[PDB]
RNA sequence: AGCCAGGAUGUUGGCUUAGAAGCAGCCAUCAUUUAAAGAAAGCGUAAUAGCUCACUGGUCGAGUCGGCCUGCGCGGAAGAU
């Protein structure tokens, strides 16, 4: 999975999440848009 | 890559960058790209950003460039000792104090201009912000 | 949504269609079709013009806001989706029975054709119209 | 003026997989052609160049799921395609007075 | 609604104007006519919203000071170099 | 009144019996025979002028054939013989390719009204005349 | 903010006729039926069909969305007794 420091939203289905204090971008639609780091 | 056409002197002084720039207001186009930060811009960065936004406006409207290099920047070649002389010129920075307008835009929708200026603010080491023409 | 200058205007204009209006009938297409839009509204072209207003906005504070000024009984029709259809030419026009015949003609539902206020009656089918 | 043959190549594919055969069309150099369904079986009249036609057989063995079948034959000398206009040497040799044609170049 | 309350300045100079600039207020002055110029302190938070209208730079202002009203025009204005804020305005009397 | 199933509105001129270079597979994409679009397609064409591209409903059913109801040709191809020039848009506001007038285009409008959905003829007048403005044509009011 | 709805007939529109057709690129960017619909933001096709949002109804029933100005922080931040 992508680990880019920048995590601007790709598709409209993305949603910012801060699990364990780590910013993430979960995506119910396309798995490729899922990415770590932020 | 912009560059002065003949000059009084080739090599010149490093010099300090203290102060704030004169180029405050937008004076041509409908929208500008004011520098919040401070620092020299090489001639390549002007051209790189220049094409990164000319694309987004799709060759439409008009985009002035308020800054021009006019400052030679020498460089000692690699593996050379100190002394012997001031080094040969390489590139032409233009010092940018805070508040300087860089690019101006006209003939395009505003939020599109927000996109065109954003993708060209990416190419510039200095931190800039979007502005707008005022009634004085 | 547009502010009060446009919302009130939509209500006051409906009031003007009540002062000269009379017979009307409910309709509630919970699953309507645009082909059905070319039936009851095309019928208005068969009758006369665009003046008819299906106005499907039966909010208790919107369409019912004009109720105290015109026909107080209509506020009881307020619950659930409702679409008034005011008439001007021909008092007791034949448009009322069409809402029931269309419901059997692919319309799923039409608020059980309960009707409005000409005899101050209730959910009563009526073939007795000036024809 | 380089040109290549482009013989037509009809093929039979199942209708359910027939929509997957249209994806092979963009990869194939051939242009679309008329075809008609035949009950559960389906077929369509293609026409693609012979240089890439030999790879078309690999496409019906995969997207067809084993139901693929096709057939064609060479026809139509017209074609023409890029790029560079490469040519196959060489012509010609073992003929009388051939070395004098080299003088004509300069 | 072109009206701005404004207390009179008491300490002119670059020193006191820095302390005042940080307090969400900026210095200003009214001048013109046979009368001598009078410096006019005024709030920054209010005027910053007013300039957005094209009329603020054209139609006459009615700044109130010490009870007395003084109609003025925005003949001149000084932008902050990069922060979105005003620094000083020349309210020429109308 | 069953909804969408397989019907489409695409075929070229009505005089072109059994088209193939134009439509071709598209009409044969369903189980309908290619012969269905010439032996029966011309059965209504003979009633009126030939060669006019008239869309028609093609609601295919499992029972071999299909029901259909002819409609009205588009106004774009109508602006040729009745407009003189066979051209149209491409250069709209930049120059005047042609012009007619309201006295004539409104006169044709009610012939298409059998397919058009309008409360009144005047409401269907400018909706058709406004399509010629997309062509760059300037109606003479 | 969610929720069953709706989200149109010619637009197979002229175009370089091999096709672009709400969505390659050109322009116009109509107007109607109307609680509402851009003659189109994205997806999906050789092209269509198809799937959403714009917007607008009802259910619902109290506050909410989006920028600026900054304070303090998060991530970006991996080295060898």
All partners of chain D with 3 or more CB pairs under 8 angstroms: F
**Torsion angle (degrees, nearest 10) of CA F84, F85, F91, F93:** -10
The two structure tokens encoding residue C120 = 């101050």
Contact D60, D69 (CB under 8 A): yes
CA dist D34 and B57 (Å) reads 43
DSSP D32-91: P-----BTTEEEEE----HHHHHHHHHHHHHHTTT--EEEE----S-----SS-------
CA A17 to chain centre: 8
Chain G: positions less than 7 Å from a protein CB are: 4-19, 21, 26-37, 39, 45-50, 55-61, 68-70, 74-76
Q: How far is CA C114 from CA B61, C1, C69, in A?
A: 61, 31, 22
B18, B20, B36, B134, best to mutate vs chain E, most E CBs in 10 Å: B134
Number of folded domains that form chain F: 2
Please name which of E12, E28, E7 lies closest in space to residue E86, comparing C-alpha atoms: E28
Phi, psi of B95 (to 5 degrees): -65, 140
Q: Is C13 helix (H, G, I), strand (E, B) or coil?
A: helix
One domain, residues F54 and F12:
yes
Tell me D103's DSSP state.
Answer: G
Q: Compute how many other C-beta atoms are within 10 angstroms of the C-beta atom of residue B29.
A: 21
The two structure tokens encoding residue C119 = 């005899």
One domain, residues F28 and F15:
yes
Contact B47, B2 (CB under 8 A): yes
DSSP C22-63: --------TT--HHHHHHHHHHHHHHS-TT--------TTTG
What lies within 8 Å, CB to CB, of F64 at 6+ separation is: none
Instruction: Give the CATH fold of the E1-94 domain.
Output: Ribosomal Protein L25; Chain P (2.40.240)
Domains for chain B: give ranges and CATH numbers.
Answer: 21-136 (3.90.1170.10)
Peptide bond just before B22 cis, omega within 30 deg: no
Is any atom of strand G within 7 angstroms of residue F135's beta carbon? yes
Contact E63, E69 (CB under 8 A): yes
Where a domain ends, among F71, F91, F117?
F71
Contact B64, B6 (CB under 8 A): no
Where a domain ends, among F27, F48, F71?
F71
Query: What is the 3-state secondary structure of B29-70?
Result: CCEEEEECCCEEECHHHHHHHHHHHHCCCCCCCEEEECCCCC
Contact C80, C110 (CB under 8 A): no
CA dist F109 and B20 (Å) reads 69
Is any atom of strand G within 7 angstroms of residue C29's beta carbon? yes
Tell me B78's DSSP state.
Answer: T
Residue F2 counted as domain residue: no
Residue F1 counted as domain residue: no
One domain, residues F50 and F78:
no
Is any atom of strand G within 7 angstroms of residue A33's beta carbon? no
Instruction: Give the CATH fold of the C1-130 domain.
Output: Alpha-Beta Plaits (3.30.70)
CA dist F34 and D37 (Å) reads 10
Beta strands D69-72 and D9-14: pairing type? antiparallel
Residue F47 counted as domain residue: yes
Cβ burial of B131 (10 Å; 0-12, 13-18, 19+) is buried
CA dist B70 and C27 (Å) reads 76
Beta strands B94-96 and B128-130: pairing type? unpaired
Contact B20, B97 (CB under 8 A): yes
C50 interfacial to chain F (CB closer than 8 Å): yes
The CATH number for F20's domain is 3.30.1550.10
Peptide bond just before D83 cis, omega within 30 deg: yes
Window B:29-48, CB contacts with E under 8 Å: 34-36
F24, F36, F64, best to mutate vs chain D, most D CBs in 10 Å: F24
B27 interfacial to chain E (CB closer than 8 Å): no
Q: Is E79 helix (H, G, I), strand (E, B) or coil?
A: strand
Is any atom of strand G within 7 angstroms of residue C1's beta carbon? yes
Residue C103's Cβ-side half-sphere holds a number of Cα atoms within 13 Å equal to 18
- CB contact under 8 Å between F117 and C38, yes or no, is yes
- CB contact under 8 Å between F120 and C49, yes or no, is yes
Tell me B125's DSSP state.
Answer: S
Is the Cα torsion angle B92, B98, B104, B108 positive or negative in sign? positive
**Torsion angle (degrees, nearest 10) of CA E15, E17, E22, E26:** -170
One domain, residues F80 and F25:
no
One domain, residues F56 and F35:
yes
Is any atom of strand G within 7 angstroms of residue F94's beta carbon? yes
What residues make up the domain containing F120? 72-140
Contact D12, D70 (CB under 8 A): yes
CA dist F62 and F41 (Å) reads 19
Chain B residue with minimal CA distance to E55?
B135
Exposure b/e, C61-89, CB count within 10 A at least 16 = b: ebbbbbbeeebeebeebeeeebbbbbbbe
Is the Cα torsion angle D59, D63, D65, D71 positive or negative in sign? negative
Phi, psi of A22 (to 5 degrees): -105, 125
Give A26 CA → G2 C1' in Å: 20
Residue nearest to nucleotide G10 (CA to C1'): F74
CA dist D41 and D21 (Å) reads 13
Tell me C97's DSSP state.
Answer: H
Please name which of C115, C96, C101, C86 lies closest in space to residue C16, comparing C-alpha atoms: C86
Total residues belonging to chain E: 94
DSSP chain F: ----SS-------TTSSS--SSSGGGGGGSS--TTHHHHTHHHHHTTS-SS----B--EE-SSSSEE--B----HHHHTTTTTS-S---SSTTTS------HHHHHHHHTTSTTT---SSTTHHHHHHHHHHHHTT-----
- CB contact under 8 Å between E57 and B36, yes or no, is no
């Amino acid at each position: 999975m992508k680990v880019r420091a920048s995590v601007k939203k790709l598709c409209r289905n993305c949603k910012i999440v801060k699990r364990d204090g780590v910013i993430r971008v979960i995506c119910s639609a396309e798995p490729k848009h899922k990415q770590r780091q932020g | 890559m912009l560059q002065p056409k003949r000059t009084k002197f080739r090599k010149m002084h490093k010099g300090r960058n203290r102060g704030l720039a004169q180029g405050t207001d937008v004076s041509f186009g409908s929208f500008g790209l004011k520098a919040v930060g401070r620092g020299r811009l090489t001639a390549r960065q002007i051209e790189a950003a220049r094409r990164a936004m000319t694309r987004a406006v799709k060759r439409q409207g008009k985009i002035w460039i308020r800054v021009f290099p006019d400052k030679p920047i020498t460089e000692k070649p690699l593996a050379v000792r100190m002394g012997k002389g001031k080094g040969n010129v390489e590139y032409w920075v233009a010092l940018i104090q805070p508040g300087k307008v860089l690019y101006e835009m006209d003939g395009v929708p505003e939020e599109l201009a927000r996109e065109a200026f954003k993708l060209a603010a990416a190419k510039l080491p200095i931190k800039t912000t979007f502005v707008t023409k005022t009634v004085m | 949504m547009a502010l009060n200058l446009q919302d009130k205007q939509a209500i006051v204009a409906e009031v003007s269609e009540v002062a000269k209006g009379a017979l009307s009938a409910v309709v509630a297409d919970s699953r309507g079709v645009t082909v059905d839009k070319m039936t009851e509204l095309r019928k208005a072209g068969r009758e006369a013009g665009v003046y008819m207003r299906v106005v499907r906005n039966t909010l208790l504070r919107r369409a019912v806001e004009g109720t105290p000024f015109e026909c107080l009984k209509d506020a009881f029709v307020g619950p659930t989706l409702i679409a008034y259809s005011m008439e001007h030419p021909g008092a007791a026009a034949r448009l009322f029975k069409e809402f029931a015949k269309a419901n059997a003609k692919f319309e799923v539902k039409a608020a059980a054709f309960e009707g409005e206020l000409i005899p101050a009656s209730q959910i009563d089918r009526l073939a007795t119209l000036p024809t | 003026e380089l040109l290549e043959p482009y013989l037509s190549f009809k093929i039979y594919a199942p209708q359910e997989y027939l929509s997957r055969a249209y994806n092979d069309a963009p990869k194939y150099c051939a242009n679309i052609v008329d075809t008609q369904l035949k009950n559960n079986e389906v077929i369509l009249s293609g026409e693609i160049p012979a240089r890439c036609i030999q790879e078309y057989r690999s496409d019906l063995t995969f997207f067809t799921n084993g139901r693929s079948v096709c057939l064609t034959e060479l026809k139509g000398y017209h074609v023409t395609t890029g790029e560079p206009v490469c040519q196959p040497r060489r012509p010609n040799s073992r003929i009388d007075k051939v070395r004098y044609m080299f003088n004509k170049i300069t | 609604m072109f009206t701005i309350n404004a207390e009179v300045r008491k300490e002119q100079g670059k020193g006191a104007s820095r302390r005042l600039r940080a307090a969400n207020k900026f210095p200003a002055i009214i001048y013109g006519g046979k009368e001598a110029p009078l410096a006019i302190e005024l709030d920054h938070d209010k005027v910053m919203n007013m300039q957005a209208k094209a009329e603020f730079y054209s139609e006459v202002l009615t700044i109130v000071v010490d009870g007395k009203e003084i109609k003025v025009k925005a003949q001149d204005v000084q932008r902050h170099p990069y922060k979105p804020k005003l620094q000083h305005i020349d309210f020429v009397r109308a | 009144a069953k909804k969408v199933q397989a019907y489409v509105k695409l075929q070229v001129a009505a005089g072109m019996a059994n088209p193939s270079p134009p439509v071709g597979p598209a009409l044969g994409q369903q189980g309908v025979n290619i012969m269905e679009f010439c032996k029966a397609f011309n059965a209504k064409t003979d009633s009126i002028e030939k060669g006019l591209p008239i869309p028609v409903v093609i609601t295919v059913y499992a029972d071999r054939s299909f029901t259909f109801v002819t409609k009205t040709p588009p106004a774009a191809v109508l602006l040729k013989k009745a407009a003189g020039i066979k051209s149209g848009s491409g250069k709209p506001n930049k120059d005047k390719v042609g012009k007619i007038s309201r006295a004539q285009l409104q006169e044709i409008a009610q012939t298409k009204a059998a397919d058009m959905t309008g409360a009144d003829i005047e409401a269907m007048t400018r909706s058709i005349e406004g399509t010629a403005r997309s062509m760059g044509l300037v109606v003479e009011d």
